[PDB]
Amino acid sequence: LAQQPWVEKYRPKNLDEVTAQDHAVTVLKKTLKSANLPHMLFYGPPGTGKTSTILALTKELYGPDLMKSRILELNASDERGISIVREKVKNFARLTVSKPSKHDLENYPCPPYKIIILDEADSMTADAQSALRRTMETYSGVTRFCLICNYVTRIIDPLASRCSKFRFKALDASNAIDRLRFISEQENVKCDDGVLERILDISAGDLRRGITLLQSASKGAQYLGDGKNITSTQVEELAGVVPHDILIEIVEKVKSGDFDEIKKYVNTFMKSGWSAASVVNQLHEYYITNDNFDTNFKNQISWLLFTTDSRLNNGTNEHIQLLNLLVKISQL
Amino acid sequence: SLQLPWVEKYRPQVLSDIVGNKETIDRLQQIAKDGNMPHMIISGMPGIGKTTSVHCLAHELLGRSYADGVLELNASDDRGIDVVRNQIKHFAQKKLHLPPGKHKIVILDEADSMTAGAQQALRRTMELYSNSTRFAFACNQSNKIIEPLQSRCAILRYSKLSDEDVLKRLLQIIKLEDVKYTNDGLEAIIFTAEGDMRQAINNLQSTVAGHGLVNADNVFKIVDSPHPLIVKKMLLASNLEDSIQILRTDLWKKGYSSIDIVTTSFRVTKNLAQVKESVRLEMIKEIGLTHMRILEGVGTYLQLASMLAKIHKLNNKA
Amino acid sequence: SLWVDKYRPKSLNALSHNEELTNFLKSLSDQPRDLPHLLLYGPNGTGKKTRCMALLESIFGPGVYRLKIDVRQFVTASNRKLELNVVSSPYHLEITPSDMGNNDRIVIQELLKEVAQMRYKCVIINEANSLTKDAQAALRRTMEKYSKNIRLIMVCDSMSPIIAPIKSRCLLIRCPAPSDSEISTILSDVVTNERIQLETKDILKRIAQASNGNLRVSLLMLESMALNNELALKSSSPIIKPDWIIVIHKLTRKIVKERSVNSLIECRAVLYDLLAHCIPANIILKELTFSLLDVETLNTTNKSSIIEYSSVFDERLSLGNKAIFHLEGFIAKVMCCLD
Amino acid sequence: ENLPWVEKYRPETLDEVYGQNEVITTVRKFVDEGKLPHLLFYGPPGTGKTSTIVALAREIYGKNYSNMVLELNASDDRGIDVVRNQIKDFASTRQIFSKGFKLIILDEADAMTNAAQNALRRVIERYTKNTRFCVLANYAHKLTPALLSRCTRFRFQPLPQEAIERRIANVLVHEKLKLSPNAEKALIELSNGDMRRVLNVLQSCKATLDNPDEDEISDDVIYECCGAPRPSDLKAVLKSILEDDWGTAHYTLNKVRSAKGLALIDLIEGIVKILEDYELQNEETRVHLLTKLADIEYSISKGGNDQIQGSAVIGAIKASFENET
Amino acid sequence: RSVDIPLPFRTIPPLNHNFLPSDYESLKDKNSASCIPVRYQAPVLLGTNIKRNTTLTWPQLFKPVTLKQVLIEPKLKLRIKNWIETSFHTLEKPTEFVPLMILHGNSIGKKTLIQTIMREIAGDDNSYQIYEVNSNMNRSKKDLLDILLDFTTTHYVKSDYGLVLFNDVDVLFKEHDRGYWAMISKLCEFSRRPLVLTCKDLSLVPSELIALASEQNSLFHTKKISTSTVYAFLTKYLKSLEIEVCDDWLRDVVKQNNADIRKCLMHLQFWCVDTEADLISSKNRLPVLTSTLGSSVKDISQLTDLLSINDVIGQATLNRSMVRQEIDSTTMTPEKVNTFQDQNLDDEMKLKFDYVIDYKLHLNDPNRQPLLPFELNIYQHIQEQLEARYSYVREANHRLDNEYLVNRFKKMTESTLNFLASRIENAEIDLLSATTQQIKAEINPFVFEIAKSDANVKNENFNADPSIVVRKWE
Ligand SMILES: Nc1ncnc2c1ncn2[C@@H]1O[C@H](COP(=O)(O)OP(=O)(O)OP(O)(O)=S)[C@@H](O)[C@H]1O
Ligand SMILES: Nc1ncnc2c1ncn2[C@@H]1O[C@H](COP(=O)(O)OP(=O)(O)OP(O)(O)=S)[C@@H](O)[C@H]1O
Ligand SMILES: Nc1ncnc2c1ncn2[C@@H]1O[C@H](COP(=O)(O)OP(=O)(O)OP(O)(O)=S)[C@@H](O)[C@H]1O
Ligand SMILES: Nc1ncnc2c1ncn2[C@@H]1O[C@H](COP(=O)(O)OP(=O)(O)OP(O)(O)=S)[C@@H](O)[C@H]1O
Ligand SMILES: Nc1ncnc2c1ncn2[C@@H]1O[C@H](COP(=O)(O)OP(=O)(O)O)[C@@H](O)[C@H]1O
Ligand SMILES: [Mg+2]
Ligand SMILES: [Mg+2]
Ligand SMILES: [Mg+2]
């Protein structure tokens, strides 16, 4: 109530207010003034402004009071393709438009069709090739269904045929930095030089992750009570990133080549608590990007890191996997 | 109009005509001759002749009293708790005068689809009225019938029909139907049957109706499955490019899904003999890994290509 | 009963080592209005569950330690009696995924729905790493849909198998292993409350170095050595290691000295004896590998092969049902390499 | 009128069902002979199974088709109970009819449960004399052998280009559209034997045109309307991996994936398909490339970090094609 | 852009498939080595026994006639017999005795025992009147309360040796058998005849009835009888019929039917008819199995790696079916529990989907369903091929299980808790809160160390009773 996560507290309420993404907001305002959209799909990195954009379209389309009744976000969730999604969709088709508001008239076209939001519903245990095709044909004039997706790997061409596919472009670092700095200024987040760039670097363009990390860092800074500017080390610790000093020690040890030294260092490093997956990712960043290594070395280390990461993802012991990876890199 | 299928036109009306499982069929014949039919659960794969065995046993046991002494309940009929508590119990309590030793038969075909509570209610019904009626189940899977029901019946596990019995009855049908047969065609019919006798009869009927003379090529035209020789050439080719071309053209572009290709490859490899047993088992392991990856969700063309590459490595090397 | 239980810090102030984490948890409990979903990760025996329990006590009260056992029985498709001990409390609930195998999704969602049926109730999840991907997705759905009434605190020894969304919607808290001095201080406190007659303080340091940053192992070794010598620890007093570790050492010795099929049959019998005593195969493989790597008659190439086969067979163990096959295959490959 | 081209260009008779010819010839022989056994039309979606059965049912049953044919769909909210109820009520009624052989078209039977399939087999066996079933499915491995043995299976293959292009010519002239040869080739190679996809993409391309009267549709229009990797993009990624530096290859891969919204699985599959056309001097190159890329795809399906997977793809291709050199 | 790949184009040769019948002849299935059905002798029927030419089932033909022939331990037989006589004598007097017996357990003669006791008490079959309430009828309050009250209140028209037996008191439907336990309680209040309850488990019986029966020492457990006595009884039964059989096949019959006298008797009723056909394979013999050494360690390494990969394949594919298997309607699924929780449904709808009352929730995964028999299973083929040439694979298939190593874990934890509590409750909850892996790896072995240390000093002469934990790990 009094507290609100900054991910949803600073969500763009106006459609045109959505930062950057002109190619989407312009066409979307045209479609909104068209008083009817076809069922549309957007693709981009999760957290680039998909849900914010669709909610803002509904904001400038329907009324705020009409909102929580007309929109049912039956997304990839407790709701099941037909067990609940289809049942609730048809029971909502049994429901008509509620009382028209005041400012809603003329200002908010409030088209009769309803909007149903399904975020990443392709990742569901129900494969509805035509279970919702029939329900958006029988209820085309009284509802529409909008979907959220990551890539252009669309599953079924039916139910995804008449789609105005909007490419939510990757959010540029400048505008993302501007938005995060604006949020920090509103929330009086005392940060020195380098916090926001580091947050964007770990979040890799994900503003949602960036905003949550900034909120967590601010909460930790208030917890300490020092009142000092947040450091990049705290942000790194709040995300699981191994410190660069440890990674440099790791690469020096694997340059040394001795099996015993590497084994002892890995034994002492497993007690620190830093995960092996972050070590593998930062080793990839240090080795593939570096221009001081031959093409053969990078080619071999790519497969080595890939195998290590694939084994680590399958729930295996981190000690053995990291020791094997570091030894194999040493033999390279 | 319609022509009677050879599956139905040449259905055994007596227990002696039924081939396969000689011991069980002979014992069922002896039971039908003498009487005192025990409760039985005939189980096994599809198409080996379970329902035919039950119906022939009931007919031979009863005779003219078959109409009023046998109650058949398939999955199409309702077999709920109410049905078991009323209809089956009233049939068991019915007073029918039969020759001594003979008993009324309650044929519950496809008992694996019956609900558990109906099976529990059937247990007391069969235990109480066993002096007048005897029950006979017929399920594809024997584990779907509750242990209380299985402890009051003689479980019959029919086995897959061997090549010899299928060949014998097929020769009988070909001889009474004036069918031109070739050794390769009949061998193809056995191979596509895989112990399913109904499948063998249907394939023979389809081949005769469509392409007349039963050659192996004619049999492999009405099975709508990957051609075993094509799959064998794909797996056993010494050039990987040729195997990839075969998989792309004759299998992937023709609409054969990954499951059918994997099944045909596994069957061919299991039937392969020129390669060693260790090589056979290792290729079978690669096919199993590919089938596993398909079951997880990764059933793309690249997985089958990698399977072919591994099989090529295993064949050319080692 | 055990000193690992009686001398368990039951308050945030009672926490001795990792003072930064203690301050962070105290500040988190300073406002009990909002607990973000916590993912406490680190080495085993580092006080992760102790700190979670202390934080829950500080928010609610000393009741969070009054635990009741509610046994839940479930039946799957193949009719197996899936029996679970669901440790509950008037304020919190505790569950453990591994105790239900592959089927850890339906049971987890049923228990979480039962919790949500009735400010908030915190659900503690031990070994969140062992959760399958579908169960982790169900947890991700729960953390967003059931955020108002359920706060999931997950304790895992490794966060790497956890999916990205769960990490993204959780406060990642790391628990580093206590240093040798901190373990020695804790053991000295246990000693001075239990009146242990040491001849010197070096014994505690030896215990700490033998336990390798594991507080539970160090405390149990203290208790065992104290009760063996009747509260009379000495320099000559050997470190009490569990029997399975000694059996693994003997197995490694046999593997190094005897490379034969009959030796492999004997190794299989030893593995069967170890697994029959309810010892998880992952730990058995870990100790076997790290004891084979410490053999002083082996060069670099053999040890690299040992670590490679250990990684491969650990991955196979994580994805397999019968562990004896994986362990025997690892032993056979090791013996083939050692030739 | 205001209808999708899917329903507008439906085959109203058996002569308009292109591509599948063996099935149509057998069905025409069936109707001419009068022997119509239980049919099972299965294959990839959009091959023309429903079109075939609808055309045949209309051709046999004239005007009474509305009452003599019941079209079911097991995927709906009925379950075994209501589905069985409807089938037995339609099959055992023997309503006032001109002739007989009431036809039941059960669509999406691969979603029917095992008990439901056995019950359907029993119902088919009981009411064979008056009711003929033409159970429809998409995959034959999801159907029980009991149902598979009571029906004459008729596999549908993906339509051949010669047909897809004929229906292209038919729809284009009637709807007054222009397809450039490269765009037509792209649509034909992108449909993969799916006429429904062709019609949907064609209608979307019509709607896309600023003046949908004489504006020719280009290759890029179809490749962006369908949402598929362009051959140029995959070829550029492949050549950057093959002949450029590791940093440049990584930059090109990331840029293409971000700009085209292309997942790594599609990139791997397209690279494999393109490299199939090209010849390799060695064979270990092909073996290692296929095996490593399949392993990468399998690991991608389970999950991980995409940067390491992309680096693994680049390294696998580079190592495989340095083996040949 | 063209962006040409630096690779020459490939001209694909045109593939043709002209297969000679010689290649078709190679499709013949090679003779399988894994399959090995070994037959037994035909049964040798001796003489013309009147029992052989019977019209009743063999389990009922050999129905017990006294209390000596029932397959139950004599102690419990005597206890039940004395309880029934005492109940008859007490209820004869005007009436602290609630007539109730719970005859729980997993034995077979849980109903013929009561009938034989009645036959012995009355001396005649017609005298005793046992009213069996079986599951084949509707055991609901509004259908049976009046009938049972009238039966247990007045005298039968004919010593009134009357009894009510509730067979299968564990399987009860939620709506069909409504108010059943209320009926049992009301009968217990207003009965003058004994009330026997039989079940396979005691969990379904309400705790009130359990406590009431345990107070009167009327809770009797039927333990399963060892296979030796079942085998001896079967040999005597076949001697009565004068049928020769090899003792190996009879041993196999006893073993495979879980020592069930009724199941074994039905199996012998089938497989002992006067026919020349050979007997069932029963325990399948070894498929020319040679568990050899394997010579070089490389071969056994390959075999073990193949075994590990096959185990991975089995774990990955043995529970992923492609055909959507259905969920049983008469099961206590959570959806069914919540459905009956809603009061919108009337009595008629609840009759359609009535579920059997249970204490264990029946959860199911619609996606991860077990493989059907007709689906492809390469894991089974690899397992049967490897077992046919290596016996230790077949041994490993059953050396360890899932119920095993978990019940052992439970017993080990119980012993550890007992040893800890015997210190010269808090553990019961906190150690349980400690993760199962931690108890398996660290707590239990160290508790064993402490137990063996305290057992050492006891032999020399801070905890007592250490021999149990010493025995558990041994
Ligand atoms: N263009 C943007 N301008 C301002 N804030 C943004 C923008 N894009 C994202 N955000 C912030 O990030 C949050 C999530 O953005 P969205 O992408 O709309 O949500 P989302 O699609 O649900 O994210 P995922 O896919 O579930 S991780 C918003 O609530 C904002 O706080
Ligand atoms: N051993 C056999 N000898 C002769 N005909 C057989 C034999 N087995 C099967 N058939 C024929 O094949 C068909 C099998 O029919 P059923 O016995 O009903 O099949 P099933 O064994 O019950 O398996 P289902 O129907 O899948 S549960 C009949 O037409 C039989 O005539
Ligand atoms: N062989 C064909 N000849 C002509 N039009 C075809 C052919 N195959 C498909 N089509 C067209 O493509 C669409 C396919 O419609 P349907 O036949 O209903 O789909 P289907 O082949 O039954 O597959 P689904 O996805 O399981 S409904 C229709 O618009 C048809 O006009
Ligand atoms: N020596 C014996 N002792 C006991 N029962 C015997 C003996 N010989 C044969 N039987 C048969 O074993 C069966 C035991 O009685 P049942 O009523 O069928 O079983 P039950 O008591 O209901 O227990 P269940 O079946 O596990 S619920 C009867 O059919 C008896 O004829
Ligand atoms: N701050 C601390 N001070 C003293 N002892 C501690 C502290 N933290 C943990 N311990 C010891 O650790 C034991 C519990 O470890 P636990 O938290 O269960 O390990 P894990 O987190 O690996 O499950 C207790 O017996 C307690 O004595
Ligand atoms: Mg979203
Ligand atoms: Mg049948
Ligand atoms: Mg259709």
Residues with CB under 6 A from ligand 5: C 4, 7-9, 15-17, 44-50, 186, 215-216, 219; E 434
Listed in sequence order, the residues at least 6 apart from A222 whose beta carbon sits closer than 8 Å to its beta carbon are: none
CB atoms closer than 10 angstroms to residue C208:
26
User: Which of D269, D260, D268 is closest to D233 using CA atoms?
Assistant: D260
Whether residue D253 contacts residue D240, with contact meaning beta carbons closer than 8 Å, is answered with yes
Which of A182, A208, A241 lies at the terminal end of a domain, its last residue?
A241
Q: How far apart are CA A82 and CA D75, in angstroms?
A: 10
Per-residue H/E/C for chain C: CCHHHHCCCCCCCCCCCCHHHHHHHHHHHHCCCCCCCEEEECCCCCCHHHHHHHHHHHHCCHHHHCCEEEEEEEECCCCCEEEEEEEECCCEEEECHHHHHHHCCHHHHHHHHHHHHCCCEEEEEECHHHCCHHHHHHHHHHHHHCCCCEEEEEEECCCCCCCHHHHHCCEEEECCCCCHHHHHHHHHHHHHHHCCCCCCCHHHHHHHHHHCCCHHHHHHHHHHHHHHHCCCCCCCCCCCCCHHHHHHHHHHHHHHHCCCHHHHHHHHHHHHHHHHCCCCHHHHHHHHHHHHCCCCCCCHHHHHHHHHHHHHHHHHHHCCCCHHHHHHHHHHHHHHHHC
Q: Alpha carbon of A119 to those of A75, A116, A128, E421: distances in Å?
A: 5, 10, 15, 54
Whether residue A316 contacts residue C319, with contact meaning beta carbons closer than 8 Å, is answered with no
Nearest CA in chain C to D305: C164
Q: In the numeric block, which tokens belong to residue A229?
A: 């500017």
Top residue of E7, E106, E136 to mutate, by most chain B CBs within 10 Å, is: E136
Ligand 8 centroid–CA D178 distance in Å is 29
Q: In the numeric block, which tokens belong to residue A317?
A: 């012991």
Which of A241, A272, A293 lies at the terminal end of a domain, its last residue?
A241
Ligand 1, atom nearest to A210 Cα: 12
Which residues in C292-327 are b (16+ Cβ under 10 Å) and which e? bbebeebeeebbbbbbbbbbbbbbbbbbbebbbbbb
CB atoms closer than 10 angstroms to residue B227:
21
Q: Which of residues 197-236 of D touch E (CB under 8 A)?
A: 232, 235-236
Ligand 8 centroid–CA D280 distance in Å is 43
What is the identity of the amino acid at A138? Answer: T
Contacts 24+ apart (CB under 8 A), B78-81: B79/B108, B79/B113, B79/B114, B79/B115, B79/B118, B80/B115, B80/B118, B81/B115, B81/B117, B81/B118, B81/B121, B81/E173, B81/E176, B81/E330, B81/E354
Q: How far apart are CA E239 and CA E247, in angstroms?
A: 12
D302 touching chain C per CB within 8 A: yes
Listed in sequence order, the residues at least 6 apart from B154 whose beta carbon sits closer than 8 Å to its beta carbon are: B38, B39, B40, B41, E266, E267, E269, E270, E271
Q: Alpha carbon of D175 to those of A332, C170, D15, D62: distances in Å?
A: 63, 56, 21, 29
Q: How far apart are CA E379 and CA E383, in angstroms?
A: 6
- What's the burial of D32, exposed, middle or buried (CB within 10 Å: 0-12/13-18/19+)? exposed
| CATH class held by domain C3-174 | alpha beta
CB distance D299–A306 less than 8 Å?
Answer: yes
Instruction: Name B108's bridge partners.
Output: B137
Ligand 1, atom nearest to A55 Cα: 18
Q: How far apart are CA D20 and CA D43, in angstroms?
A: 11
Q: Please tell me whether residues A262 and A133 are part of one structural domain.
A: no
CA torsion angle C266 C268 C269 C270 (round to 10): 90
| φ, ψ of residue A144 in degrees (nearest 5) | -140, 155
Residues with CB under 6 A from ligand 4: B 127, 148; E 59-60, 62-64, 69-71, 108-112, 167-168, 233, 261-262, 265
Query: Which residues of chain E have a CB within 8 Å of the CB of B229?
Result: 17, 19, 23-24, 27
User: Which of D308, D259, C140, D254 is closest to A44 using CA atoms?
Assistant: D259
Q: How far apart are CA E378 and CA B269, in angstroms?
A: 12
Ligand approaching nearest to the C-alpha of D168: 3
Q: How far apart are CA C269 and CA E455, in angstroms?
A: 27
Listed in sequence order, the residues at least 6 apart from C304 whose beta carbon sits closer than 8 Å to its beta carbon are: A259, A327, A328, A331
Q: Please tell me whether residues A218 and A311 are part of one structural domain.
A: no
SS3 label, residue E331: coil
CB distance E372–D114 less than 8 Å?
Answer: yes
Kind and range of the H or E element at A160? none
Query: Which residues of chain A have a CB within 8 Å of the CB of D296?
Result: 306
Strand D152-155 and strand D39-42: the pairing is: parallel
Ligand 3, atom nearest to D5 Cα: 29
Listed in sequence order, the residues at least 6 apart from D10 whose beta carbon sits closer than 8 Å to its beta carbon are: D51, D54
Whether residue D162 contacts residue B115, with contact meaning beta carbons closer than 8 Å, is answered with no
How close are the terminal C-alpha atoms of chain D, in Å?
60
Q: In the numeric block, which tokens belong to residue B243?
A: 């195997």
CB distance A312–C161 less than 8 Å?
Answer: yes
Q: In the numeric block, which tokens belong to residue C249?
A: 């050492």
Ligand 5, atom nearest to C186 Cα: 4
What is the identity of the amino acid at C41? Answer: Y
CB distance C308–A324 less than 8 Å?
Answer: yes
SS3 label, residue A230: strand
Q: Please tell me whether residues A285 and A332 are part of one structural domain.
A: yes
- What's the burial of E421, exposed, middle or buried (CB within 10 Å: 0-12/13-18/19+)? middle
Task: Note the CATH number of domain C180-233.
Answer: 1.10.8.60
| φ, ψ of residue B49 in degrees (nearest 5) | 105, 40
SS3 label, residue E363: coil
CB atoms closer than 10 angstroms to residue A201:
17
Listed in sequence order, the residues at least 6 apart from D59 whose beta carbon sits closer than 8 Å to its beta carbon are: D13, D14, D31
Q: Please tell me whether residues A231 and A250 are part of one structural domain.
A: no
Instruction: Name C85's bridge partners.
Output: C71
Ligand approaching nearest to the C-alpha of E60: 4
Which of A186, A218, A241 lies at the terminal end of a domain, its last residue?
A241
Q: How far apart are CA A226 and CA E222, in angstroms?
A: 73
Q: How far apart are CA E378 and CA B291, in angstroms?
A: 8
Ligand 4, atom nearest to E70 Cα: 3
Ligand approaching nearest to the C-alpha of D55: 3
Kind and range of the H or E element at A36? none
Q: Please tell me whether residues A129 and A198 are part of one structural domain.
A: no
Cα angle A154, A155, A157; round to 5: 85
Ligand approaching nearest to the C-alpha of A168: 1
Whether residue B130 contacts residue E60, with contact meaning beta carbons closer than 8 Å, is answered with yes
Give the domain ranges of chain C. 3-174, 180-233, 243-338
Kind and range of the H or E element at E457? helix E444-460
Ligand 6 centroid–CA A70 distance in Å is 19
Which residue in the set C177, C303, C314 is minimally distant from A320, CB to CB? C314
CB distance E428–C69 less than 8 Å?
Answer: yes
Q: How far apart are CA A329 and CA E95, in angstroms?
A: 89
| φ, ψ of residue B105 in degrees (nearest 5) | -120, 130
CB atoms closer than 10 angstroms to residue E326:
17
DSSP string, D147-212: HHTSSEEEE-PPPPHHHHHHHHHHHHHHHT--B-HHHHHHHHHHHSS-HHHHHHHHHHHHHH-SST
Q: Please tell me whether residues A178 and A195 are part of one structural domain.
A: yes
Contacts 24+ apart (CB under 8 A), D236-244: D236/E1, D236/E3, D237/D267, D237/D271, D238/D271, D238/D274, D238/D275, D238/D317, D238/E5, D239/E3, D239/E4, D239/E5, D239/E6, D241/D313, D241/D314, D241/D317, D241/D318, D242/D317, D242/D318, D242/D321, D242/E5, D242/E6, D242/E7, D243/E6
Q: Tally the domains of chain A.
A: 3
Interface of C with D (CB under 8 A): 133, 163
SS3 label, residue E195: strand
CA-proximal residue: ligand 1, atom 8 (nearest) = A49
CB distance B262–E376 less than 8 Å?
Answer: yes
The answer, yes or no, to whether D and E have at least 3 beta-carbon pairs within 8 Å is yes
What is the identity of the amino acid at C63? Answer: G
Q: Is C234 annotated as a binding residue?
A: no
Q: At what angle do helices C323-338 and E297-317 cross, to 10 degrees?
A: 150
Q: Is A208 in the pocket of ligand 1 (CB under 6 A)?
A: yes
Query: Which residues of chain E have a CB within 8 Å of the CB of B46?
Result: 374
| φ, ψ of residue A118 in degrees (nearest 5) | -135, 100
CB distance A306–D311 less than 8 Å?
Answer: yes
Q: How far apart are CA A211 and CA A5, in angstroms?
A: 9
Among positive and negative, which fits the CA dihedral E180, E185, E188, E189?
A: negative
Q: How far is CA D34 from the centre of its chain?
A: 31
User: Which of D140, D313, D172 is closest to D242 using CA atoms?
Assistant: D313
Query: Which residues of chain D have a CB within 8 Å of the CB of C163?
Result: 303
CA atoms within 13 A on the CB side of B223: 23
How close are the terminal C-alpha atoms of chain A, in Å?
56
CA torsion angle C122 C124 C130 C136 (round to 10): 0
Specify the length of chain B in residues: 318
SS3 label, residue D107: strand
Q: How far is CA D133 from the centre of its chain?
A: 23
Residues with CB under 6 A from ligand 2: B 7, 11-12, 18-20, 46-52, 140, 161, 169, 197-198, 201; D 146
Residue ranges for the known binding site of B for ATP are 7, 19, 44-52, 140, 198
Q: Please tell me whether residues A107 and A219 are part of one structural domain.
A: no
CA atoms within 13 A on the CB side of E138: 16
SS3 label, residue A268: helix
- Domain C243-338 CATH (choose: 3.10.580.10, 1.20.272.10, 3.30.1490.20, 3.40.640.10): 1.20.272.10
Which residues in A237-251 are b (16+ Cβ under 10 Å) and which e? bbbbbbeeeebeebb
Q: How far apart are CA D254 and CA D311, in angstroms?
A: 10
Q: Is D8 annotated as a binding residue?
A: yes
Query: Which residues of chain B have a CB within 8 Å of the CB of E331?
Result: 116
Residue among E58, E66, E72, E111 to mutate when testing ligand 4 (max atoms within 8 A of CB): E111
Q: How far apart are CA D113 and CA B186, in angstroms?
A: 34
Report how this structure was experimentally obtained: cryo-EM
D80 touching chain E per CB within 8 A: yes
Q: Alpha carbon of A59 to those of A7, A51, A143, A200, A269: distances in Å?
A: 18, 12, 16, 28, 51
Strand E44-45 and strand E243-244: the pairing is: antiparallel
CA-proximal residue: ligand 4, atom 25 (nearest) = E108
Whether residue A120 contacts residue A148, with contact meaning beta carbons closer than 8 Å, is answered with yes
Q: Alpha carbon of E26 to those of B55, B271, D225, E20: distances in Å?
A: 38, 9, 50, 11
SS3 label, residue D105: strand
SS3 label, residue A191: strand
Whether residue D183 contacts residue D223, with contact meaning beta carbons closer than 8 Å, is answered with no
Ligand approaching nearest to the C-alpha of C173: 5
User: Which of E136, E169, E166 is closest to E151 using CA atoms?
Assistant: E166
SS3 label, residue E149: helix
Q: Is C48 annotated as a binding residue?
A: yes
Q: Please tell me whether residues A70 and A202 are part of one structural domain.
A: no
Q: Is A29 in the pocket of ligand 1 (CB under 6 A)?
A: no
Looking at E131-276, list the stretches that DSSP marks H as alpha helix, in order from N- to C-terminal side. Answer: 141-153, 180-189, 207-215, 227-241, 247-256, 261-271
Q: Please tell me whether residues A134 and A194 are part of one structural domain.
A: no
Q: In the numeric block, which tokens belong to residue D1?
A: 């009128």
Q: In the numeric block, which tokens belong to residue E359?
A: 């204490």
Listed in sequence order, the residues at least 6 apart from E113 whose beta carbon sits closer than 8 Å to its beta carbon are: E64, E67, E70, E72, E77, E80, E103
Q: Which of residues 104-133 of D touch E (CB under 8 A)?
A: 111-116
Q: Please tell me whether residues A143 and A189 are part of one structural domain.
A: no
Ligand 3, atom nearest to D10 Cα: 31
Q: In the numeric block, which tokens belong to residue A273?
A: 């608590």
Whether residue D35 contacts residue D128, with contact meaning beta carbons closer than 8 Å, is answered with no
CB distance E446–C324 less than 8 Å?
Answer: no
Residue among B48, B176, B198 to mutate when testing ligand 2 (max atoms within 8 A of CB): B198
Ligand 4 centroid–CA E71 distance in Å is 8
User: Resolution of this PDB entry, in A?
Assistant: 3.2
Domain that holds residue A276: 242-332
Ligand 1, atom nearest to A208 Cα: 12
Strand C81-88 and strand C68-75: the pairing is: antiparallel
Q: In the numeric block, which tokens belong to residue E294?
A: 């394997």
Cα angle D231, D237, D238; round to 5: 85
